[PDB]
Assembly symmetry: C3
């Protein structure tokens, strides 16, 4: 007649690491590192991104002919370009504060193209000018949203037009100045040398002057076009005033913003799809606190880490057949044959044997570990972020500062997440150990001298312990006085 | 005759969370999150802030008439402004590298006004030019620290004046150029069309041409004034020259810096108050490592976190009566209301009485231990002076965003780590108490050996008479086993 | 009889734990690196560029004072004196200077070339110089640059170009001269309303000279404004000017792996090797933290605001959660040298100490994993902490400071607390190891022995060396000696 304290073992091969040990096999585990995505570009919190594919934001906004037909949703949650768009400034040049502009339209309400300065109303200038650099099929053309003002006959009178933003929303307006190859070209196109482009609003005062230099051809053009932009407040007016070289907008873009986002550089396309965390490889749908998919995410995302593996122990050390000496200790092996709990008893008497899980201690352990896992996951704070940024090539220092920052956080999170898992895994194994030792002690303190401590977690009865008796032990209501007399001999 | 091991219980309903459990009731606890402030704007380490009220820094430095009766201390540790200052560039315009200027004077020594270019000495120019965009009461007026040079009679001769910085300190100097709305304006003000403004020091070299162009009226003006600034070094000279459109300074500002600070946007005004950590809602007075009061602080501050609650268990699990080591709420089913003199102790019964006594040794151990734990979590926090809030122009959104992403970054790190630290430390504090009771019980057991019987929940029944002196020797670990058998009673 | 016990020694090593301060332990491991070699070293095989008291502009422009500089063709970082003495001897400025410096902190390789031989400026005077760049002490000039001035009394259009056929991107610098007055303009350039224009396939620029009275610097009221571009392979740069152009005669072939930084120090290269350099000396450590100096370059440990980070490895030195060590087993044993935990026995045959190498070995393996967990998990990517910002970039500089201070705070705190937490666990781990040992014997002997309460067991039967051995290894035969008669 004997009763034994034991613990669960199974066919698990799942390993974890702890602070003190490596590759420990445990009965149950849970990975808290998200490693999978759906390989798709999705809508973010219900809003699609703006898809530019081959074109750059400049090529699109200016209306580079290979871009001016782009579809264009009225509202988007982020922007998807390719790494290096083929179609941008068809006519070569530069764009002032181009990155700031990109950052501005990265997420919008609301965005709508509007005709603000009908091109036919430049009655004193020629308006049909174009370039072979922007040729189609294959006549010379030009940015579709813009107007190249040149002299009419031999005259370029001052060009003065204004527009009042009665639209109802702030309006993005873009304009440019042309820098010819030489003075002769300057005289041919604008008749006068020594000209200026002047743009003014309530908040903006900008003047550019043509800068003529000898340049290698780009897209077959030695000339350059330099563009600028502003936000025109509602009910405000913008005044264009130029004696030559102005590249005027014919259109403006109504814009409302909801906050900011980012550009995501990928070769993928939108699908009928919903996510809260987008990566260039696909979308993440996860509750886990960490992922290792891609650094450049957009949305409310888990923390990116370097690790390939973050597995928490939930079950106990799997010993098919610690701090507290019981598990894989004086109770040297686990019972492959206890399926109904983590800890329990095996009993032998005239009636049989023997496996019975302790429901309470098991229930307490499940609660405990459930809280552990939930602690590590739920306490992670998450807010919307767009990780990737645009910097120009005279902003390497700024780019580098942003890189050091993202690297510093990567280091902090990777280090802490690894050690957290190592520490908690250690303590989890010991938690189970403790639970078993306490179960073993409940039985001991009940039996005392009415049984012998057989070692290996077994108790040898000095009396006849029937099934009902065994149950009284298993439920902590064993009747010691009843089995005095019939004890050893006494 | 018996002696029982036990542990403190009390009235507390104070709750903590651990890694394994939520809302555990403990006898004592300490909040390590600072949640309160004094609702005052205060001096920062002895030094007051500069108060600007409704004026922006530009308005104040240029001397917008609405700002020209303003305090201005000899020295400040930060700048207080209202969220959107009413008074700035009264005549419409702009200010080059304005954010840098603002950052520069965020905290000064020492800040002294000097009349470097007395206006009355522009003898070949009209100097009393004013505008309705700066109307005083309610006559035309102008920035009181600046001089609008305009034609005298029908003439605007070349204007050349210079100044040597013999102030013995770096000097902040501001100047402007006027961009008229039209040629008639250029002509009225400066006679000549085709003018220039030129400014030169040892390190600064700048020449600008006025931009005449039609613009929407702001404060009734199509024109704009564009201001720039430089620091004139000790003993260096600044040369002004203009055939028109120069907005000259009459004053410069001797400036000495002892580090940088920031600007705090609030409606509060300075009070006779001292703090090391200021927020827009009021000052924080604390040694605690974390706070949740406001993100935009100035001073030496606790780490800001996104939690409502960070409570460390100090006492033990409160189990008043009518764990890893299995004693507390375990084989010793409950605690003792009646033991006030310690955390763990004994109850003894014998012929002479009974019998609560705190075990002094293990109680002291526990007090020292928990005291060190709390002190570890609090003292190890490195805290240096910072001004969270920053100024970025409307064309520095990427930069502003970089700043936001950084603060959010440390916010997430500190919040996650603080929440987890507490959960983990509370877990171990409960187990420490549990262990302490378990060890105390074992201490008695190992002394008594078979001179006593283990009775259940923490109690020993002696097989021999144990009077108060015997109890004492047990309580202080000098029990005398060989003396007490009489363990013929054991059989 | 037989007693369980643990190692003690003559250590005075002190560690702190979350619960306790100044605990003496048998052994401990410092994880904070505090020493450097006091030398300036090569970085993974490659030396720094050493500029003495010449600034980078002074060097690239060819300030006469910088002639005996002698560069290298490849370098891993740049060493500059805290405050260079030789920069723009002719007063002026340098557009996007800091971006230039950042671009050349680390190259492979670098080579000056004569892209625009000055002999070929046949329609201009090229001998112009200034007492501001005086050599010995006659007027001189930046040696890589060419001050063009009127020839006789004519300054024909200056028109030259260059095609980068050198096979490498080429750094090219030019300047414009802003004279002090009109007399100076005419003396130098004849013409008055002149320009300098520069063009490549990406660069477009036309500058007008600013003539204005300024304070004398190095005796000059005039100023030279320099700008730079990176010319692509097979691209062309075109200079055109009617005056005021300060032209390059040379360009610099440049290839970059990645970026580094500039170290300010007085020290000079000393023929050592390192993978982590501070301005005080190089660091050679496997440890995860260091407190030598903030501004490092290379693959460095995390820098922290800490004087001491000592990890306990051994046990409390006694010449805990489990109550064994410094508990019911009052003291350690000097005499037990082979292990952390063990036995002492008293016999008819003798005594005494025997290390239990199983539990010791399991412990050594455990602590070793802990230590190397703390160390190896640390990331160490190459980096250059120090950064250059101009005097109108204070906000950006302060933003960078805020970031460094941020990580420092995080790392200092986590490192301090990590050490305190792990140390309390280490001590309790040893305590538990002793307790389980004592219980291993107790649960074996059972009825056949007396538990004294000081770690000792007193046999109710004779226990010879062999019996003792079965106890010391968990094969003790309880039935064999069961003859009670206690
Ligand atoms: C319908 C209309 O013309 N009203 C507004 C007017 O309030 C404003 O002054 C002007 C901008 O100058 O824009 C327009
Ligand atoms: C089996 C046994 O020991 N007898 C009683 C049983 O009647 C009761 O149901 C149990 C609690 O469930 O406690 C005990
Ligand atoms: C802009 C330019 O002329 N680049 C030339 C390229 O046309 C030519 O193929 C090569 C041959 O030397 O040299 C380079």
């Amino acid at each position: 007649d004997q009763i034994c304290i034991g613990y669960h073992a199974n066919n698990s091969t799942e390993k974890v690491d702890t602070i003190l040990e490596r590759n420990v096999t445990v009965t149950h585990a849970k990975d808290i590192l998200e490693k999978t995505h759906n390989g798709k570009l999705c809508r973010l919190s219900g809003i699609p991104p703006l898809e530019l594919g081959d074109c750059s934001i400049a090529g699109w906004l200016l209306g580079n002919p290979e871009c001016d037909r782009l579809l264009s949703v009225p509202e988007w949650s982020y922007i998807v370009e390719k790494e290096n768009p083929v179609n941008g400034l068809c006519y070569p040049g530069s764009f002032n504060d181009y990155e700031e502009l990109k950052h501005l339209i990265t997420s919008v309400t609301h965005f709508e193209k509007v005709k603000i300065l009908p091109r036919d109303q430049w009655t004193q200038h020629t308006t049909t000018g174009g370039s072979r650099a922007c040729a189609v099929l294959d006549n010379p053309s030009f940015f579709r949203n813009m107007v190249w003002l040149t002299k009419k006959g031999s005259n370029y009178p001052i060009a003065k037009r204004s527009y009042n933003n009665t639209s109802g929303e702030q309006m993005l307006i873009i304009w440019g100045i042309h820098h010819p190859n030489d003075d002769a070209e300057q005289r041919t196109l604008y008749q006068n040398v020594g000209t200026y482009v002047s743009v003014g609003t309530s908040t903006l005062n900008k003047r550019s002057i043509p800068e003529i230099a000898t340049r290698p051809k780009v897209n077959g053009q030695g000339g350059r076009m330099e563009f600028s932009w502003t936000l025109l407040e509602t009910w405000d007016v913008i005044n264009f005033e130029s004696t030559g070289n102005l590249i005027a907008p014919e259109y403006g873009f109504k814009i409302s913003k909801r906050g900011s986002s980012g550009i995501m550089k990928t070769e993928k396309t939108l699908e009928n799809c919903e996510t809260k965390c987008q990566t260039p490889l696909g979308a993440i749908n996860t509750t886990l606190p960490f992922h290792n998919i891609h650094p450049l995410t957009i949305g409310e995302c888990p923390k990116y880490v370097k690790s390939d593996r973050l597995v928490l122990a939930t079950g106990l050390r799997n010993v098919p057949q610690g701090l507290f000496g019981a598990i894989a200790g004086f109770i040297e092996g686990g019972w492959q044959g206890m399926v109904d709990g983590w800890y329990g008893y095996h009993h032998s008497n005239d009636q049989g044997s023997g496996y019975a899980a302790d429901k309470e201690s098991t229930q307490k352990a499940f609660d405990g570990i459930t809280n552990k896992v939930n602690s590590v996951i739920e306490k992670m704070n998450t807010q919307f972020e767009a990780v990737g940024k645009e910097f120009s090539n005279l902003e390497r220092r700024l780019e580098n500062l942003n890189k050091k920052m993202e690297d510093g956080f990567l280091d902090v999170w990777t280090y802490n997440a690894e050690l957290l898992v190592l520490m908690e895994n250690e303590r989890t194994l010991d938690f189970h150990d403790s639970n078993v030792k306490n179960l073993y002690d409940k039985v001991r303190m009940q039996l005392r001298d009415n049984v012998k401590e057989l070692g290996n977690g077994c108790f040898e009865f000095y009396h006849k312990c029937d099934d009902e008796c065994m149950n009284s032990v298993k439920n902590g209501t064993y009747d010691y006085p009843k089995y005095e007399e019939e004890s050893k001999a006494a």
